[PDB]
Design a protein around this ligand. Sequence first.
Ligand SMILES: CCOc1ccccc1N1CCN(c2ncnc(N3CCC(C(=O)O)CC3)n2)CC1
Ligand SMILES: CCOc1ccccc1N1CCN(c2ncnc(N3CCC(C(=O)O)CC3)n2)CC1
Ligand SMILES: [Cl-]
Ligand SMILES: [Cl-]
Lengths: 242, 242
Amino acid sequence: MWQENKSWNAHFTEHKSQGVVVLWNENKQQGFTNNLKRANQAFLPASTFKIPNSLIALDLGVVKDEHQVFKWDGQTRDIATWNRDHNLITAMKYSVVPVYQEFARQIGEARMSKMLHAFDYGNEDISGNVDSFWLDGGIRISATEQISFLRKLYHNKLHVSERSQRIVKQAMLTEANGDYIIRAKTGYSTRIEPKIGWWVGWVELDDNVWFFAMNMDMPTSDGLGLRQAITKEVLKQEKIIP
Amino acid sequence: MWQENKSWNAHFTEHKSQGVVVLWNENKQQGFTNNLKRANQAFLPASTFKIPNSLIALDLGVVKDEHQVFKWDGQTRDIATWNRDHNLITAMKYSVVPVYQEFARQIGEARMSKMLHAFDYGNEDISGNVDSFWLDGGIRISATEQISFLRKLYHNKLHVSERSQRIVKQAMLTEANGDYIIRAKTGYSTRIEPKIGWWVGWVELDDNVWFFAMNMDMPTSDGLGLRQAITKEVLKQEKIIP
Ligand SMILES: CCOc1ccccc1N1CCN(c2ncnc(N3CCC(C(=O)O)CC3)n2)CC1
Ligand SMILES: CCOc1ccccc1N1CCN(c2ncnc(N3CCC(C(=O)O)CC3)n2)CC1
Ligand SMILES: [Cl-]
Ligand SMILES: [Cl-]
């Protein structure tokens, strides 16, 4: 099932960094990582929780569809892209926490807990504020647990409507060309030490899917682009993307 | 509602070419084109017909979902990418005509006509061979009629399940980055002598979507890249993409 490829650690060291990348070959049903311990270490999901959060909001009509416009609340926050109107597509792309905080408050702590248990999502614990638990409450999920959750989403096997799963998979769209499609979601955990940067999703090829879950130590916000860069270098080495 | 802009013809003449580009601003309900007459002249859809053909095949259950595998028949054809197994995603991406000819035979004359009428697609005429009418039969569609059709698809308004429409829009994914998403379909009309290349679809942006339909005279296969290139030079002049 799982296989440790120590050679990917060079992509972390050359960038003054430390972390884990986890890949899963869907056709062959084989997994790969540079660090199996860290691959199974559970962290706060941070904004990667926007994937299950959207699925719950959509199956509950808190979000009607991907074009509904939730406008700014007039409060200027420290990330410029947040201070405007958004839909599901753009709130996911720019990781607009206030929008999903409003979703969370509308979902409710009860329905949130039941749905995460149904998703088998991490430790299934929402202790804390209903609108911040994924950022500074009790929820914990590991890299291999992200892949397990993403594989069910890819196959429409989560305990929500197929429509909700298709919409969220649409909103996860990050990059596409004639070689590959990436559906993914970034995340940055800052409230609990050590600070952690996430990238989780998958790569669609013509005749295979490669799921990935990555996290790395991220002391400041200036190295956040290293999440995609390191992940891509592993993908280039494994001949997954050209 | 419609405005002419002959500045765009410079992009055509720059490449010793001729054709039409039609843009539709969804927010403004406003349209633009370099040649109004040509914008409303009907042509064979060629492989742009794979958009409606896919919708009908999915709705009628000829295609179960975007993962079902259509086996190569073993007949070696001139386009190398056709000589392999395909699913709906890859059959669209590589314009695999033989796969869609099998769809059309399964759908059949009676159901194909009824669905095209319900779609109000072009002249709604499928006279000719059931498995080749979009390539050398009687169906005809204009650039502006393509947009009218695409707008209905985008809003899930066609007489097919929302699921059918969602799957075809996923299969139309062509290009995506941080700036825009392009969902489109190429086409190459070669059997009636006004031999033309098509590119129809739309560009998704954060706060808007720009529908487009273009066709140009295309004497050989070597100029096919000019469909996307000229279209993009127009989108970059209107500052629709960076
Ligand atoms: C409004 C409620 O706020 C909180 C409530 C409760 C706890 C924490 C927050 N804050 C803390 C600050 N934060 C933050 N910091 C740095 N970069 C980013 N970014 C967004 C996520 C991006 C990503 O996904 O990579 C990276 C940049 N976010 C957002 C969450
Ligand atoms: C199998 C049945 O065929 C026929 C039956 C009946 C009439 C015509 C065809 N033929 C003609 C040859 N053809 C063709 N030629 C050149 N390039 C391409 N291409 C595919 C479309 C691509 C595009 O979508 O842009 C461009 C390349 N296709 C496919 C359709
Ligand atoms: Cl396949
Ligand atoms: Cl998509």
